[PDB]
Amino acid sequence: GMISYLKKAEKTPETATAQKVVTEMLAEIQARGKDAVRQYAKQLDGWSGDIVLTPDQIREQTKDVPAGVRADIDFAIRQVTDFALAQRESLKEFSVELHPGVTAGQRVLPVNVVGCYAPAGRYAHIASAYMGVATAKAAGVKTVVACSSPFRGQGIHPHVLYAFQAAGADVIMALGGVQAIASMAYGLFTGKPADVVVGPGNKFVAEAKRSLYGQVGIDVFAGPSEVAVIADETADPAIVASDLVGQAEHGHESPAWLFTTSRDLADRVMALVPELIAKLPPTARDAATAAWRDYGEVILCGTREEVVEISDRYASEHLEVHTADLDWWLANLTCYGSLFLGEETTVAFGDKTSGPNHVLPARYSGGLSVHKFMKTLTWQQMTREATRQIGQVTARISRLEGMEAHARTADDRMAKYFPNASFEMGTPVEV
Amino acid sequence: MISYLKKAEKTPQTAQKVVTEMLAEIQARGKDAVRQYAKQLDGWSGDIVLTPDQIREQTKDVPAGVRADIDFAIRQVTDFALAQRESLKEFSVELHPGVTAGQRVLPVNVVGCYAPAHIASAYMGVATAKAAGVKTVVACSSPIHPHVLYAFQAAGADVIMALGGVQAIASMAYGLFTGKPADVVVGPGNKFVAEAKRSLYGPSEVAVIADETADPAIVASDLVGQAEHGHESPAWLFTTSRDLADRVMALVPELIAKLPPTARDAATAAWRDYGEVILCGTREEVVEISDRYASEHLEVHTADLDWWLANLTCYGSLFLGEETTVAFGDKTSGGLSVHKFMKTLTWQQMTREATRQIGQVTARISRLEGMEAHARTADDRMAKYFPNASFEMGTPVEV
Ligand SMILES: [Zn+2]
Ligand SMILES: [Zn+2]
């Protein structure tokens, strides 16, 4: 019954002045198209060079990326690709017979164009650059357009650019912020408007994606990196603490949660975390100090079932499980971004997918995966014979609804397909 | 090679802020506050949650012939939804040796359905959610048209509530009366209901593709069919045949004129203001157009139906061939399907051996990104699993 907070969030988790800026910028971009984008690039980034990169510029600007660094990025990207490919196979097409003579089915096809944004900020994961691109390509999307702002006057940060290329981007553009999102959405420079745009950004990028796409633009986890660990008495406190500190270095708002049934484990982690932080270099130390302090939580529960309940409520983007009987946890947890089962894997090793935007005040729906880039289209087809029954039912129900024209769609078919037969087609609507 | 033989004459012209007040009251006061708004908006001072007896009583007047019709209609949605559910598969896969990953597929716990009209608008949400395996479906309808109430029950609603508007949506969302907050609420609603759902989790088209083999009488009747809904119902004809386009453009007014008053009025306005007839040179141009307009309901009256099924890429629901038609009913809405009510959860697990490579790749990438704490999670596993190892884990971050 009694859940026990050994450590509480000492601060609670947003002005929408982004709304004005985006409205204004989109208005301008709708008006002047490429020239407004190019001018925004100049005013905001000081950029005067080419927007669309050529295959030669790509090779040139990545030439100084060493083989060891390239092989590591290649490896990381392949982990994503291999999972996305398997996931693509998990949504099947089918046909099914319903009422005899009725056939219906689902087609599954990738969207035509996906735009991928990489903010390439100072403290960014390279995975932010390749995850969208790799996933879209593995979904079968035919055109992936990738944007990242110029790094230091030369062009796109070379690692981000290498990642874009290695992940299979079809077009790469040196563009940042709202004007990148808008250029992708409207198909500026390529003539290929994006069916969806993905990629983490500041509140302006978020707001442009919302404005242009609605819910499908804001249904991916955004905001400070999270980590949660479920642990029982078998868990190693030194590993649990390390993992929490791992994402706490992201910045002062990064939440780090431990859910446990072991008082002993909770106690040791709570003591270990500050010690681990103190041994980080300055930027990380200061970042994690604040993050652990204001957003770090430790929750001791009596039973496994209560852990599940609170974990499902918190719905961490990244959820590690360090327990005996891992099968039970996979079977019983229901809300999270992605699950890391067992001690061996860990959050830093990387996501296969990105979870939904669970911190939205729809919380379970969306995320970055192949499913985001797939359409399911439904169809039906009937023999004449099938309509004998369905025509009747439609006419009658229709006339009960007062939908006289609907009914005649059925009358006309009944007349045409069964000329020498009469049917109870309902009493016509006079009103 | 594309010409509009009939264009749309206008676009929809242009409030729902009270929500905040109703909601703020409901939040602070709960059931009481909702009960308040029941008498005040619907003249209801009975119980909200109906009991099985009430449901049987209030639907006892509904004849067995009508019930059979509705049950059948529901089955044609249910049976499709059951197949569609099985199209999203759980799986496990081995990536890099010793890396296992997978996908669970889980129905949500609770769905709320609002029915404010086609009876289909009442049963589509409920039947879809039940076919998806949702264990609790709450259905609301402002006080209840016996057909709507019969539809809820026959479709498999678990709780039915005589409740309307924002009260209904907020009730289901907060889970007042039942104690079961909906993971999502669905239904057709007014702008108040629209803003209510838009706060809490935030006209019927018809298009016909026709070639020279199409019967223009049937094509006209079908366009007329959905025009009769309101004055804002769009009815689009995409065609490669001027002959059909003219004969349709000719017969539509004559069909409208023969409809009873309300429908005549509705369909006149709609056909005038929103009707479009677009002639194209090639099948490829029709596809280009159809996909741009992405009609919610798209009929195809052509030779070579397989080609259109293969090439059309944007629509809500395809009606393939002449025999079926929009009035027969959707299987899904473009949207509402079983997929809307199911979660995908992804997981990974690794052997120690897998981390030998994955951990050192991670440590090196992490340190290049300036992410020292990240790198240390890899270091710590390497030390635990491979104690005497000396792999390249990258230079520690000093900054
Ligand atoms: Zn991280
Ligand atoms: Zn209709």
Author numbering:
A (entry chain A): 0 to 12, 15 to 362, 367 to 436
B (entry chain B): 1 to 14, 19 to 120, 125 to 151, 157 to 215, 225 to 356, 372 to 436
Show me the paper's own sentences about this structure.
Here, we study DHPS-3-dehydrogenase from Cupriavidus pinatubonensis (CpHpsN), a bacterium capable of utilizing DHPS as a sole carbon source. Kinetic analysis of CpHpsN reveals a strict preference for R-DHPS, catalyzing its 4-electron oxidation to R-SL, with high specificity for NAD+ over NADP+. CpHpsN forms a domain-swapped tight dimer with 28% of surface area buried at the dimer interface, with the interface featuring extensive hydrophobic and hydrogen-bond interactions. Domain 4 lies at the C-terminus and contributes to the active site and is also involved in dimerization through a metal binding site. Coordination of Zn2+ involves three residues from one monomer and one residue (His411*; * denotes the other monomer in the dimer) from the other monomer, showing that the enzyme forms an obligate dimer.
Initially, the protein crystallized as the CpHpsN·Zn2+ complex in space group P212121 and the 3D structure was solved and refined to 1.94 Å resolution. CpHpsN structures in both space groups contain a dimer in the asymmetric unit. Comparison of the CpHpsN·Zn2+ and CpHpsN·Zn2+·NADH·R-SL structures reveals rearrangement in the octahedral coordination environment at the zinc center. In the CpHpsN·Zn2+ structure, Zn2+ is coordinated by four amino acid residues: three histidine residues (His126, His251 and His411*) and Gln248, and the remaining two equatorial sites (#3 and #6) were modelled as water. Analysis of the interfaces using the Protein Interfaces, Surfaces and Assemblies interactive tool25 indicates that the CpHpsN·Zn2+·NADH·R-SL complex forms a more compact dimer versus CpHpsN·Zn2+, with the increased buried surface area from 9620 to 13 250 Å2 and decrease in ΔGdiss from 84.1 to 98.7 kcal mol−1. The root-mean square deviation of the CpHpsN·Zn2+ and CpHpsN·Zn2+·NADH·R-SL structures is 2.0 Å over 407 common Cα positions. In the Ramachandran plot of the CpHpsN·Zn2+ structure, Asp352 is placed in the right-handed α helix region, while in the CpHpsN·Zn2+·NADH·R-SL structure this residue lies in the β-sheet region, demonstrating a significant difference in the loop conformation near the active site. In a similar manner, Ala121 in the connecting loop (residues 120–128), which is placed in the left-handed α-helix region in the CpHpsN·Zn2+ structure, moves to the β-sheet region in the CpHpsN·Zn2+·NADH·R-SL structure.
